[PDB]
Amino acid sequence: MQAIKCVVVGDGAVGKTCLLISYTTNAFPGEYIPTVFDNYSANVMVDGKPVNLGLWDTAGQEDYDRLRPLSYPQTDVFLICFSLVSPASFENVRAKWYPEVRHHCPNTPIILVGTKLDLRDDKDTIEKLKEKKLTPITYPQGLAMAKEIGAVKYLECSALTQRGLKTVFDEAIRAVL
Template sequence: MQTIKCVVVGDGAVGKTCLLISYTTNKFPSEYVPTVFDNYAVTVMIGGEPYTLGLFDTAGQEDYDRLRPLSYPQTDVFLVCFSVVSPSSFENVKEKWVPEITHHCPKTPFLLVGTQIDLRDDPSTIEKLAKNKQKPITPETAEKLARDLKAVKYVECSALTQKGLKNVFDEAILAALEPPEPKKKRKSQLFPQVAGNQEFLLCSPAKSTQVG
């Protein structure tokens, strides 16, 4: 069975771990959320063939800058995450995260992922941002950055409501399986299979890389 390795990066507190827990368990974690999620293998059916999607969380804090790249070898696709209500995390996509992954894995495709979209219309969140003369990141702004940084595409989701959540990982799988050139042709063949036949078979966690 072919394995697809998907590594999730981005600033601390943008919801990377909640994203993975919500996707693999089909529910938002209501209590304790660990700094780093145990790695999981999820079985995904694509065109009638089973693939193992290996999901690897990373810690975004600077304390882990030397340790984090140990997760990068053999990565098939990266998810570069930011919170749509954290302009600093969006800025760090360009300043830190894309330079880091392209330094270690220059040929590996990546998606730009906006998280916490349920907070984009939240009055208290908007008010806090306004006090700093800031606004939530719009999809159009994020799509432009994705193009500028040569991401495969921009996708966004809410781990809380699960809106757009499955699509993030469908697109990650497609990016990992598609060669750079005939993207459109492969996508039309693969996407209905991914969207229609995904199965969750949670295996025992892979060896944990939990760091604190």
Template sequence: MQTIKCVVVGDGAVGKTCLLISYTTNKFPSEYVPTVFDNYAVTVMIGGEPYTLGLFDTAGQEDYDRLRPLSYPQTDVFLVCFSVVSPSSFENVKEKWVPEITHHCPKTPFLLVGTQIDLRDDPSTIEKLAKNKQKPITPETAEKLARDLKAVKYVECSALTQKGLKNVFDEAILAALEPPEPKKTRRQTTPVCCTSLCSSMLRGGGDSGYGGEGAQPGVNNTKRLSQHHEHLL
């Protein structure tokens, strides 16, 4: 069985652990959230072939700066997270996180992930930011940064409501299976790949939860994505 290693990085308290717990258990951790989430394996079926998606949480605090890179080798895709209601965490994407992962894994694709989008329209959160002359990060602003930093793309979600949650990991799988290739000359032909097929199957589940298997119009409905979760031994 092929394995896809996905490592999640970003400032502390931006919701990385909640993101993983909500995705793998289908529940938001309302009581206790560990500093570093246990590694999980998610089995994903793509076109009848099983893939194991290994999810690795990391601690964003400076205390772990020397230990964190130990989890980077053999990573297939990174999720670089920031909170859409934390401008400082957004700034650190450019100042800290992308430089760190590109230093250790220069050829590994990464997605820029905005978290806590349920707070973007929260009055108390907006008021708190306004006191510091700040505003929530807009999708347009984040998309521009993703382009500037050469991320595969920008995606955003809420671990609380699960809006966009499944899509984050669907896109991570696609990025790992079909990493961006360098631009080729006109004489070279582009090989046929499974991007569109995988994309159709992965997007069939929608955003309502991690395990949906809705059919995609125009796609053979026998080819769907399914998944279950296991602790890594």
């Protein structure tokens, strides 16, 4: 039965750990956001075909350029993540994440994932960006970034509302099948 290694990369601001807990538990962790998501596997059916999905977190590695690539060999698909309310995290897709993923895994599919969709419409979030002369990342910005890095999909999601969350991981599996 086909086994899929999926590694989640991106800035601290994406909320990678919270994304994986929310997906795998089908609930925002709410009260307390755990710092640890240990290597995970579950059977998940996509288009009738059962698949064993492996998920690795990389939270804690954001500052260790030579440690992060130890996780990359034999990856079947990458989620390269940015927060839709962190223009710095989006630009880091181009500056940091795509280059090292492509250097180490030149033929491995990438899903570009915009997280924190729930906050793109948040008045307080929008105002805090406005004070820095910034705005949230919009849908065509993600499409244009996806095209530039060769991502097979651009997908937007919220761990809070679960909006688009299941689709991310379905499309990671589809990128490999």
